[PDB]
């Protein structure tokens, strides 16, 4: 599922995200859209071998298991198909987790670049919330 950028702020407020840890919606809606481009399915390897998976493409050697990266933590304890599906549950509990692991939302490298500082705010313009 290649999600609406209002109906991904619906679902992640919905979920649990808005304000998480200090995190404003839009924090979260800027992070999506320069991680996965809205879409569920979104994989990408890494050099070191691992995988990023889904619409916020969360690490396979730390967070999720995929079976093809050793020294895989699992520490949501899910594989990592789990990720890529239209209900974004798994992934949010899950960024739930690593947004609290230490740094914040600087875990995710794209946000950490694009997104920090900037007017995040205007992620849900428009978005009836």
């Known amino acids: ?8 702020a619906a679902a992640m407020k919905r979920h649990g995200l808005d304000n998480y ?13 320069f991680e996965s481009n809205f879409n569920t399915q979104a994989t990408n390897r890494n050099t070191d071998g691992s ?13 999720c298991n995929d079976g093809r990266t050793p020294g895989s933590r699992n520490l949501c ?19 739930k987790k690593i947004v609290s692991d230490g ?8 946000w950490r670049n694009r997104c920090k500082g ?12």
């Open 103 to 110: 740094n914040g939302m600087n875990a995710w490298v794209a």
């Open 118 to 129: 900037t007017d995040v705010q205007a992620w849900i313009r428009g978005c009836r919330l």
């Open 51 to 63: 995988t990023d998976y889904g619409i916020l493409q969360i690490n396979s050697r730390w967070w």
């Open 21 to 33: 840890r200090g995190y404003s919606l839009g924090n979260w809606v800027c992070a999506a859209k």
């Open 77 to 95: 304890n899910i594989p990592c198909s789990a990720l890529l599906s239209s209900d974004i549950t798994a992934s949010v509990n899950c960024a």
């Open 1 to 8: 599922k290649v999600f609406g950028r209002c109906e991904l």
